Amino acid sequence: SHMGAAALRSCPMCQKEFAPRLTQLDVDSHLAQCLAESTEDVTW
Ligand SMILES: [Zn+2]
């Protein structure tokens, strides 16, 4: 599947950039907390 298993180097959910020191596990770590928050309506 195309839109199934992929790997990103940043967080397009909150427009965040992952540092170079971070590992594959780190990226997924935040990717889970980001989607877990479901807060994509930041109006500040
Ligand atoms: Zn995020």
From Swiss-Prot:
Changing residue 11 to A: Abolishes binding to ubiquitin. Abolishes binding to ubiquitin. Component of the Fanconi anemia (FA) complex. Interacts with FANCA; interaction is direct. Interacts with REV1. Reported to bind monoubiquitinated REV1; however it binds better to non-ubiquitinated REV1. The lineage of its organism: Eukaryota, Metazoa, Chordata, Craniata, Vertebrata. Component of the Fanconi anemia (FA) complex required to recruit the FA complex to DNA interstrand cross-links (ICLs) and promote ICLs repair. Following DNA damage recognizes and binds 'Lys-63'-linked ubiquitin generated by RNF8 at ICLs and recruits other components of the FA complex. Promotes translesion synthesis via interaction with REV1. The gene is FAAP20. Zn(2+) binds at residues 11, 14, 30, 34. It is found in: Nucleus; Chromosome. It comes from the Eukaryota. Changing residue 34 to A: Abolishes binding to ubiquitin. A zinc finger (UBZ2-type) spans 8-44. The UBZ2-type zinc finger binds both 'Lys-48'- and 'Lys-63'-linked polyubiquitin with preference for 'Lys-63'-linked polyubiquitin. This is Fanconi anemia core complex-associated protein 20.
